[PDB]
Design a protein around this ligand. Sequence first.
Ligand SMILES: Nc1nc2c(ncn2[C@H]2C[C@H](O)[C@@H](COP(=O)(O)OP(=O)(O)O)O2)c(=O)[nH]1
Ligand SMILES: Nc1nc2c(ncn2[C@H]2C[C@H](O)[C@@H](COP(=O)(O)OP(=O)(O)O)O2)c(=O)[nH]1
Ligand SMILES: [Cl-]
Ligand SMILES: [Cl-]
Lengths: 302, 302
Amino acid sequence: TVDGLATAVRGGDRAALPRAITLVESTRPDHREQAQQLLLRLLPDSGNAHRVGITGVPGVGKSTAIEALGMHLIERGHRVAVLAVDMARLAVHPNAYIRTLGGVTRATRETVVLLEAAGFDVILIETVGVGQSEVAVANMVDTFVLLTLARTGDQLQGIKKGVLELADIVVVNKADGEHHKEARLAARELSAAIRLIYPREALWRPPVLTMSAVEGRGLAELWDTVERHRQVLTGAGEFDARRRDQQVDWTWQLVRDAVLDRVWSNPTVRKVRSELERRVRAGELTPALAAQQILEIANLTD
Amino acid sequence: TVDGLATAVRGGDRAALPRAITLVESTRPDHREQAQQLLLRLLPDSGNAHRVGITGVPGVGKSTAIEALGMHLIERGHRVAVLAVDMARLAVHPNAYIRTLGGVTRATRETVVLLEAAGFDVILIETVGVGQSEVAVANMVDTFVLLTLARTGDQLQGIKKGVLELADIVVVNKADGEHHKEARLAARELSAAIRLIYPREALWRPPVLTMSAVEGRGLAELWDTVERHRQVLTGAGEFDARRRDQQVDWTWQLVRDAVLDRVWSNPTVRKVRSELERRVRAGELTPALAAQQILEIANLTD
Ligand SMILES: Nc1nc2c(ncn2[C@H]2C[C@H](O)[C@@H](COP(=O)(O)OP(=O)(O)O)O2)c(=O)[nH]1
Ligand SMILES: Nc1nc2c(ncn2[C@H]2C[C@H](O)[C@@H](COP(=O)(O)OP(=O)(O)O)O2)c(=O)[nH]1
Ligand SMILES: [Cl-]
Ligand SMILES: [Cl-]
């Protein structure tokens, strides 16, 4: 019935999909093994989709933009899924589906495989600035979009530094009310910075667009740019290359996390960490000697 | 004579220091243990120094700037060490000392402890864009300086993206000949981008300076800014905080590298990696199943 579940999901059975996602989200070691066989079976039916990441600060307008984009897309014949890695008009529609960082990252990546196997051709993955969540989403999508504020000199308030460089497309949102002209200036400032950061880029220099997600303006143009991104990368053979690299990278991350977890989650290492850290912070112990004691203690109690 | 070596180094014996550095650089497992006791003994004599990282593309003018800065400093009573993580006027002077990423990072960090114990109060650490070398240097210094070109719209040619955000101070070098006016404009462009990236920074927004390292102009002003950096961070209690955090982070990196090495350097894992990677890249195997096989195989042959 792993085979049964896989037949149901790829056939479009709407009841099978949530159950597969639950199987996939199960931390229970016996479910992990079934989940893996199911994914192995569905892997060949996946990949036929554009995965788009969406980030920006609380209140910048991510969920408003996502609802609007999702309707834009549904009306053009797509089947759209929305996941979040920490929208009522959208969630009612039959062609939409709305649903540790290591743990949530893993469950989200596996869930994408199920959704694509189930016929979803657009996958929107939303995140906020929590820990390393932006990098995790950027590493599982084709196109990563950053929403910013439409204020000259203040577009990136509250964004973790380094996040700008993850973006394939940058959007100055809320380009309405008293800020039409200002949004254009704000966009031109970000474009100037992107030109500095990507001075001789030949394939894809991140465009900067304006949008009013609440007035439904610039959404279509945003999606037109997302499609151009895929077309440009596909013509260079880089769309498939990025995916293959992400998958290999993720494989090694899983290896890393498995071996590091043995140490990090050891209760006795947990008990003595503070004092070993205090001793390092105070110059009483070298980092190499603290590291050795951490490994010795893990080994003694594993 | 670990005790003997430690007494000689902290007493200023110029012959002891190179030998300690050689001990520290020894990959031989018996030397590592002596090295650790020596560092433990010298740790309390270290820290009385300003550690400055210097990066930028090949030919931007790093070694020219370093030689000039090092003489500037020697003439002001400092004892200056220069390390490189991949200058003849300087190397002749008695108050100067010129000398795997994980391995070189480790040896450089430990060497800083020896140098500081030996009376060096300025440590300049040079790197280029090789792998993750910039981040490694930024994580072992107090102040990280990025040199760029003095050309409008082309300052960051050849720099890995994300490196700009590591900088505490940015310098447009070669502000001479036909580019005096242009260097000022180039500096103003980078300043604009830094204002965008750090829109509401209250403690330290990276200044952008001009320099002609070959005409010895702007070096003094660069050092004045490096001192201001330390003064500002020290007044906020952040200079010591950054160091303590770097040391703790490095401790855990050593733990990580020790446990991951058991897998990464296993010959049998090395043999089968390509095919397991090929199978992942082709959608024949899930990343989680490839990861499990990697761990199983390491375990079988360790
Ligand atoms: N003026 C203006 N306001 C907007 C726009 N898009 C969203 N908003 C409003 C709706 C909410 O009151 C608030 C936050 O929106 P949201 O969509 O919940 O933001 P987010 O927290 O999901 O990023 O901003 C927009 O395009 N213009
Ligand atoms: N015009 C000009 N040329 C400079 C300046 N500083 C260094 N140079 C020259 C000296 C070398 O010919 C070349 C590269 O300098 P370098 O100091 O070896 O660069 P790097 O590879 O260590 O970064 O550039 C400078 O400030 N102005
Ligand atoms: Cl492609
Ligand atoms: Cl301090």
